[PDB]
Amino acid sequence: PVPSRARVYTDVNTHRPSEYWDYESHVVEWGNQDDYQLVRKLGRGKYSEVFEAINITNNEKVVVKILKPVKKKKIKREIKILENLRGGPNIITLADIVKDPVSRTPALVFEHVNNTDFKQLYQTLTDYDIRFYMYEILKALDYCHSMGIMHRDVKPHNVMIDHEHRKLRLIDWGLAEFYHPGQEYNVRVASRYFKGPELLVDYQMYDYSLDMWSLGCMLASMIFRKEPFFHGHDNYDQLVRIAKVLGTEDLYDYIDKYNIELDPRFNDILGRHSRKRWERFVHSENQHLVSPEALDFLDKLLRYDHQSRLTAREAMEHPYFYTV
Numbered sequence: 001p002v003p004s005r006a007r008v009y010t011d012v013n014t015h016r017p018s019e020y021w022d023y024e025s026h027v028v029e030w031g032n033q034d035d036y037q038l039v040r041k042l043g044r045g046k047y048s049e050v051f052e053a054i055n056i057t058n059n060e061k062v063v064v065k066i067l068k069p070v071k072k073k074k075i076k077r078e079i080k081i082l083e084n085l086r087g088g089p090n091i092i093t094l095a096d097i098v099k100d101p102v103s104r105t106p107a108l109v110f111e112h113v114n115n116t117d118f119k120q121l122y123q124t125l126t127d128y129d130i131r132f133y134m135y136e137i138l139k140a141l142d143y144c145h146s147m148g149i150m151h152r153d154v155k156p157h158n159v160m161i162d163h164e165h166r167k168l169r170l171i172d173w174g175l176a177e178f179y180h181p182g183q184e185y186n187v188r189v190a191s192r193y194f195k196g197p198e199l200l201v202d203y204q205m206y207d208y209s210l211d212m213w214s215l216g217c218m219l220a221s222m223i224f225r226k227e228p229f230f231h232g233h234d235n236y237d238q239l240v241r242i243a244k245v246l247g248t249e250d251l252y253d254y255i256d257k258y259n260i261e262l263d264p265r266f267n268d269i270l271g272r273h274s275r276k277r278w279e280r281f282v283h284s285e286n287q288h289l290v291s292p293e294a295l296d297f298l299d300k301l302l303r304y305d306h307q308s309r310l311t312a313r314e315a316m317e318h319p320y321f322y323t324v
Contacts, residue, residue, distance in 0.1 A: 002258045005181040006207035008311045012148040013178050021148065021178045023080035024073060030099040033107065036064060048174075052112070055095075061112035062095055066105055074174070075106050081149055081176045082108070088147065090140040092160070092171045113171075116163040118156050122222060127289050128323060130222050133161065135316065135324045136168040137215060142312035144170075145208040148179050152189040154214035156221075179207055190214060192238055193228035197251070197304050200239040201260050209306040212315070216301030223294050225286040236265050246304060247275035254304035293320040 013021045035057050042050040047068035055062050067075055082094035096109035137159060144151060151158075153175040160169045175189050184204035190196070196213035198206040220229035230245070232238025243251055248270060255262060262270075278295045297320040300310045310318070 001203060001205070001260055003182060004203075004205045004207070004258065004307065006145075006179060006209065007307060008313065009145050009148060009179070009208065010181050012146065013180055016148070020084065021180075023077040023178075026076055026080045028076065028079055028097060031096040031109070033098040033100040035096075036062065036098065036109065038064060053109070055109075063110045063112050064098075065108045065110065067107065069106055078174045078176065079108070081173050081178075085144055085147055085149065085173070088140065088143040090136050090168050090170055091143065092169045092173075110171075111169075113160040113167070113169050114162050114164075115160045118161075121161065121163065122225065122227070125222070125289075127291065127294075130219075130289060130294075131321060131324050132166070133159075133168055134215075134219060135321050137170065137218075138312050138316050140168075140170040141208075141211055141215065142316060144176075145179075145211070145312055149176055150179050150206075150208050151176050151211050153191065153194075154211045154218070155191050155194045156218055156227075157191075159218075181207075192232055192235065193217060193230055195235065195238055196306065197239065197242060197254065198306050200235055200242070201255060201262065203258055203260055203306075206306060208311070209309050212301055212309045212312065213306070215315075216298060216309075219294075219298055220281075220302065223286065223289045223298070224281045224283075225289070226281065236263070236269060239266065240269050240271075242304075243270060243273050245276050246302070248273045250275060250304050257305065291320075293318070293322075296320070 035055060037054045037056055039052045039054060042052050042063065047070045049066045051064045053062045053064045069075065079097055085091045086094055093111040094108060095111055098107045098109060099105065100107065151170065151173065153172060158170060158172045160171055177185065185206060187199040187202055187204060190199060194214040194217045196210045198210060217229050221227045230238065230241040232241045278299055282290050297318050303309050
């Protein structure tokens, strides 16, 4: 395959010391798990249980995410990235890292976010509300990309919103990674519906632009009221769902540009498809959330060619955000 590199923040990690990006060499210091009283279970992930807690030393609410220690090198990567991004705009704040004295299970302690339900939100959300919160996610992404970090798991479940206080936080940095130009990354990242074409075709030399595809998917779901926008049933089908909107012509143009070898599993499922007009997704239920500016913006994010997508900073300058 043809090599590729990010159009922005390309060498931010190359010009920094080894300590900033060498998460394997990072020294982790545990706190007193005894300083926290677990109140209630908030949810459960693959290898994590999340609890609402009280920091007893200051009577403040916190969120404790207890990690099933399945991969130690991965826990170190998440801790290092959370420490580097601490205090960045709309980035979840890692307050502490505790190990329980008896269990010794790693636990990350975060600032409490009083999240408002997404199933309930997308019905009460106005055209302006979508623009405001999209700008808030772009603040977080432009910050973390400038810090040489790709989130690699942008999706609505990883965006916490306190609608009453108009506060937004980008969470779950467990899949995040340091961007190094020329590096070949594992494509088994992000959640199926938000996976960029680069991951689905096994193009390993991807960058921050992966996050911009995912953001485009979230935007497309909010404005059109279609969740998810690209509803794949597996990773192979996911590309077929994308191909049903952006056409097979541009897909072959993308794989030819980067000399990508398509997996034989795509032979009997890809077929032939035309490029669709974004206006075809406009209906009575969603038209109050759609505008020419919103459609132009979406068109500029949802592109096969990872290099052709708007960067987080270019996206922030789009006419769609002139009202924010």
